[PDB]
Design an enzyme around this catalytic site. Structure first.
Site, short mmCIF file in Angstrom:
data_model
loop_
_atom_site.label_atom_id
_atom_site.label_comp_id
_atom_site.label_asym_id
_atom_site.label_seq_id
_atom_site.Cartn_x
_atom_site.Cartn_y
_atom_site.Cartn_z
N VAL A 26 0.82 -1.20 0.00
CA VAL A 26 0.00 0.00 0.00
C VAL A 26 0.87 1.26 0.00
O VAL A 26 0.48 2.26 -0.61
CB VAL A 26 -1.07 -0.01 1.10
CG1 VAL A 26 -1.70 -1.41 1.23
CG2 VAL A 26 -0.51 0.42 2.43
N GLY A 27 2.04 1.20 0.63
CA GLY A 27 3.01 2.31 0.63
C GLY A 27 4.31 1.96 1.35
O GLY A 27 5.35 2.62 1.16
N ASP A 160 0.26 8.60 13.98
CA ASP A 160 1.58 9.23 14.16
C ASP A 160 1.70 10.25 15.29
O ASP A 160 2.63 11.07 15.26
CB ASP A 160 2.09 9.85 12.82
CG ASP A 160 2.52 8.76 11.80
OD1 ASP A 160 2.68 7.57 12.19
OD2 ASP A 160 2.74 9.12 10.62
#
Ligand SMILES: CCCCCCCCO[C@@H]1O[C@H](CO)[C@@H](O)[C@H](O)[C@H]1O
Length: 332
Positions: A26-27, A160
């Protein structure tokens, strides 16, 4: 210790426990996977160069400590953490498993025109997550729509927190500013909320100076009360030397917005950080009356961040990280 299997995805080697199937890029790098244990989709992040420098070793540790701490509905928390390594000496790779939410707030604004009820619900959840993060004396520092995962029910999780476009960054961080506090996150919320209302980026600056210029057009050059607090002489005229402007009336900028939304924006988007509404205060604001429950907006356990002050060798950061991996207890 589970059985691992190896696979190569986009020339990267993934070594994962068998419980995690269907790995899909996905990344570090992220793979979507199917967790055969819980029957859910998860994201598995292989950290890239975890231990390459002292600075990297420290941030790998920071990331893990933060993710292990977060235990709140609107903050992403750690579903699993593992390494192929038996023993500290073979320890070289770190993988972090989290809920795959499926979309971010960024993808969501570009399609849906959001209703007023959606903006109430979405901002409420960001604030509820922030009240928790800030109660652990953590600052997100880079709150933005790509750090916001939202599912089919417009339920939201903050990614995050505490780990770090400039469009959502508070002015004090844009100007460096010796030391700032949790209120920078509220500036970010104001920027997000404005955009959820209008569909448009509030301050889409081209670069750093262009960003600051847009911010000043909306909120006006600092007033005398803010200028009194500014201890640096040069910052003081770099200011009185950017173009003189008055504060715009937000009732006039967000036309057709709910007046309580406009009022709360007015209280978030204030240059002077000391005067910005707090996360707890905002949750009590009349705009979220449908959603606010004082009995269900929990605070964090204390987070020991003393490690932030320390300067350790790569091997020590690495062993500290390995201790955290071993001590990890999965959620219910
Ligand atoms: C465009 C000029 C930027 C002005 C932004 C200053 C607002 C930040 O606000 C300042 O932040 C500090 C914490 O970071 C506080 O110690 C100061 O008291 C407060 O005024």
């Amino acid at each position: 210790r589970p059985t691992f299997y190896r696979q190569e995805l986009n020339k990267t080697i993934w070594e994962v426990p068998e419980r995690y199937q269907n790995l899909s890029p996905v990344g570090g790098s992220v793979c979507a996977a199917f967790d055969t244990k819980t029957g859910l989709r998860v994201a598995v992040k292989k950290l890239s160069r975890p231990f390459q420098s002292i600075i990297h070793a420290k941030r790998t540790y920071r990331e893990l400590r933060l993710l292990k701490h977060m235990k709140h509905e609107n903050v992403i928390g750690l579903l699993d953490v593992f390494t192929p390594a038996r023993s500290l000496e073979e320890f070289n790779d770190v993988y972090l498993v989290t809920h795959l939410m499926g979309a971010d707030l960024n993808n969501i604004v570009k399609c849906q025109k959001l209703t007023d009820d959606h903006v109430q619900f979405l901002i409420y959840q960001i604030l509820r997550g922030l009240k928790y993060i800030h109660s652990a004396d953590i600052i997100h520092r880079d709150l933005k729509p790509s750090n916001l995962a939202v599912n089919e029910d417009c339920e939201l999780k903050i990614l995050d927190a505490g780990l770090a476009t400039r469009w959502y960054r508070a002015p004090e961080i844009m100007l460096n500013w010796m030391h700032y506090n949790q209120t920078v996150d509220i500036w970010s919320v104001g920027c997000i909320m404005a955009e959820l209302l209008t569909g448009r980026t509030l301050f889409p600056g081209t670069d750093h100076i262009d960003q600051l210029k847009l911010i000043l057009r909306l909120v006006g050059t600092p007033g005398a009360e803010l200028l009194k607090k500014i201890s640096s002489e040069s910052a003081r005229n770099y200011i009185q030397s950017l173009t003189q402007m008055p504060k715009m009336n937000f009732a006039n900028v967000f036309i057709g917005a709910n007046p309580l939304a406009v009022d709360l924006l007015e209280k978030m988007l204030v240059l002077d950080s000391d005067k910005r509404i707090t996360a707890a205060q905002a949750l009590a604001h009349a705009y979220f009356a449908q959603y606010h429950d004082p009995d269900d907006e929990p605070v964090a356990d204390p987070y020991d961040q003393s490690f932030e002050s320390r300067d350790l060798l790569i091997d020590e950061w690495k062993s500290l990280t390995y201790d955290e991996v071993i001590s990890f207890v999965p959620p219910p």
